[PDB]
């Protein structure tokens, strides 16, 4: 970003009008001008179950391969959207639930309330971090 002085560019792959892959690059050499891969997002849609899965991969510079970094599951329930963010646990071979977000709108798509949670790894229960009504609904 602007504050850290690091520039990135992306390349999107579309399929049937939807984004299925987004690859992130950075320019790390001028003797070549080659854009180096940094991150890759893969999107898995399921219209019937109203669920989108975004899988994130990070470029492993030692192995020169992609490695599983995280997973975001977006579930739609009309006025309610639930987002679960999980981190890949390398030495477990599974995804650990980390953050959860809930967005509630009215029937006109105006946000009513937003909630954020962080997973307590000791108790396996979500900790509330944020809960706020928007000014129009604050009444
Ligand atoms: Cl980007
Ligand atoms: Cl494309
Ligand atoms: Cl939607």
From TrEMBL:
Domain of life: Bacteria
Protein's UniProt name: Exported protein
Protein's organism: Bacteroides fragilis (strain ATCC 25285 / DSM 2151 / CCUG 4856 / JCM 11019 / LMG 10263 / NCTC 9343 / Onslow / VPI 2553 / EN-2)
Organism ancestry: Bacteria, Pseudomonadati, Bacteroidota, Bacteroidia, Bacteroidales
């Amino acid at each position: 970003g602007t504050n850290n002085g690091k520039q990135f560019i992306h390349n999107d792959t579309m399929e049937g009008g939807k984004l299925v892959c987004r690859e992130i690059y950075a320019m790390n050499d001028a003797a070549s001008g080659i854009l180096n891969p940094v991150k890759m997002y893969k999107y898995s849609y399921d219209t019937d179950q109203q669920k989108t899965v975004k899988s994130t991969y990070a470029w492993n510079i030692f192995k020169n391969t992609w490695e599983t970094e995280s997973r975001t599951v977006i579930s739609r329930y009309e006025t309610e959207t639930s987002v679960e963010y999980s981190v890949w646990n390398k030495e477990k071979g599974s995804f650990d639930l980390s953050k959860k977000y809930i967005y509630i709108t009215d029937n006109n798509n105006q946000l009513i309330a937003q909630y954020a949670y962080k997973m307590n790894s000791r108790t396996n229960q979500w900790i509330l971090e944020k809960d706020a009504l928007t000014p129009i609904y604050e009444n």
